[PDB]
């Protein structure tokens, strides 16, 4: 059929032997091959990693709840540890960290080549510990930012009423049990406006994502027909298809979802499902474009490797990871109630009012 790439294997073996022979430190073959595994996994896909025995044990059970962390969720798509999203209600967000900016060094250690997992692990620490991050803002001059890491506990959902008849549902992060809270907030809001609403500006911006089950629950809340997300990957078990229950606490309210450059996989799932099913109107800026799903594959003996086993897909053929979510209307956030604060929210609320008026009664 086809010839084996024996030339490349021979070249690798000879390279290994020459590296062992002509190196400074006495380096044994075991370390060389372990580094080979680590680096092939790293170069193949930045999110993938080789969780060895001790790392596997650490992943099996959480160490402790005392450890806090900056909270920012990062991604190595740019070659450095890029800040995909500073989670709301967190010291990182309160600082000058803005999604899309890089992190060159952490506490004085450059992160030009180190893996994302190592950088994130070094980020987490004891409550109240100071830390200095060197952040390259849109290719500008690097600057140092001092932050105090602490335990992170972000309320999932926040329901306000921008105007009698108009709601506003901010989803900070897709933690567990987000579906229950979202449904309860929708119910209490519906009660607030006498069991009827004219709009609901679901604010999924600067969202670092979360549990896919909770995202599917949220997308179900507003939907009664069609699928939310379906996965694709080479392994047999890669495909996973999700459905929407007919019941809906939304009550057919016209919707406007706001998309900011800090959107993540789960927020992308909800936004893409709502947009593709023609049940919403995306209004913010472009999304981020992260949809890969990583599954830990058990190894031969008390080892494992986290590899990107599949990627998500919105109900249409569009793949969120490849292109992200492209909103129907692109409104750039800027300074001019929550409406009076940001330009995106004011534009969305005005659009909802205009749509309500122009639809007739």
């Amino acid at each position: 059929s086809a010839p084996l790439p024996l030339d490349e294997l021979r070249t690798f073996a000879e390279v290994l032997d020459r590296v062992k022979a002509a190196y400074v430190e006495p380096v044994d073959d075991k370390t060389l091959l372990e580094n080979a595994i680590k680096g092939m996994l790293s170069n193949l896909d930045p999110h993938s990693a080789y969780l060895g025995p001790e790392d596997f044990a650490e992943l099996q059970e959480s160490t402790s709840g005392e450890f806090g962390g900056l909270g920012i969720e990062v991604g190595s798509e740019d070659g450095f540890i890029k800040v995909v999203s500073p989670i709301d209600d967190t010291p990182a967000a309160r600082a000058g960290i803005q999604p899309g900016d890089l992190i060159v060094q952490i506490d004085g250690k450059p992160t030009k080549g180190q893996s994302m997992t190592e950088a994130v692990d070094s980020m987490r620490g004891k409550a109240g510990s100071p830390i200095t991050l060197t952040i390259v803002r849109d290719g500008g001059r690097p600057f140092d930012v001092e932050l105090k890491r602490a335990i992170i506990k972000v309320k999932s959902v926040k329901s306000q009423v921008l105007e009698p008849g108009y709601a506003y549902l901010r989803i900070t992060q897709f933690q567990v049990n987000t579906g229950e809270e979202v449904v309860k907030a929708l119910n209490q809001l519906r009660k607030d406006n006498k069991g009827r609403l004219k709009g609901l500006v679901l604010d999924l911006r600067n969202n670092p994502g979360g549990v896919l089950q909770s995202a599917v629950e949220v997308a179900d809340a507003f939907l009664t027909k069609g699928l939310i997300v379906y996965t694709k990957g080479r392994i047999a078990n890669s495909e996973l298809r999700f459905s929407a229950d007919p019941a809906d606490p939304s009550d057919k309210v016209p919707l406007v979802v706001l998309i900011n450059g800090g959107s993540a996989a789960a927020a992308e799932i909800v936004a893409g499902a709502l947009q593709d099913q023609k049940r919403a109107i995306l209004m913010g800026t472009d999304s981020f474009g992260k949809g890969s799903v990583q599954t830990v594959l058990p190894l031969n003996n008390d080892r494992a490797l986290k590899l990107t086993t599949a990627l998500y897909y919105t109900p249409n053929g569009r793949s969120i990871q490849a292109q992200g979510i492209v909103p129907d209307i692109e409104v750039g956030r800027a300074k001019v109630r929550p409406q009076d604060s940001d330009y995106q929210l004011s534009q969305a609320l005005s659009l909802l009012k205009g749509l309500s008026v122009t639809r007739g009664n």
């Binding site: 086809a2 790439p5 024996l6 294997l9 000879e14 073959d29």
Partner: protein, 140 residues
């Protein structure tokens, strides 16, 4: 266009290369012979046969040469090397068959050394080989 190593083939070839570089050449030859048997690919047989010839063994060299020649019929050098190695063992009718197969594609041919190697066997085999050579001459 490039085949893909199976797990066992990859592991065996890696350890064979490591052994060959660490001077444990017997391990390399054995692993390469086994991989030539299983995979049946040209390149593996090529490396196995070159290693076997360098070492100088006869049985492994013959087996690997036959596997290589069958796995790469296009390669005339493979065919003539297999014929030579077989002639080392006292078989020559297959040697002349392989020489004729090479004769289809123009290239360097080995006839005098094989004739010398076949002139020392039993009289019947040499007579049959000479008859076959004369018939081939009538064919050319």
């Amino acid at each position: 266009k490039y085949g893909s190593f199976s797990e066992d083939s990859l592991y065996s070839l890696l350890v064979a290369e490591l052994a060959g570089q660490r001077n444990r050449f017997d391990i390399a030859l054995s692993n390469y012979v086994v991989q030539a048997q299983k995979t049946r690919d040209p390149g593996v047989s090529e490396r196995a046969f070159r290693i076997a010839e360098y070492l100088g063994a006869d049985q492994e060299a013959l087996d690997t040469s036959l596997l290589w020649a069958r796995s790469a019929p296009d390669n005339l050098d493979a065919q003539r090397a297999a014929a030579i190695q077989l002639a080392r063992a006292g078989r020559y009718e297959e040697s002349m068959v392989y020489m004729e197969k090479v004769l289809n594609g123009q290239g360097d041919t080995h006839f005098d050394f094989l004739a010398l190697s076949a002139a020392e066997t039993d009289p019947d085999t040499r007579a049959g080989l000479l008859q076959s050579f004369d018939h081939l001459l009538k064919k050319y």
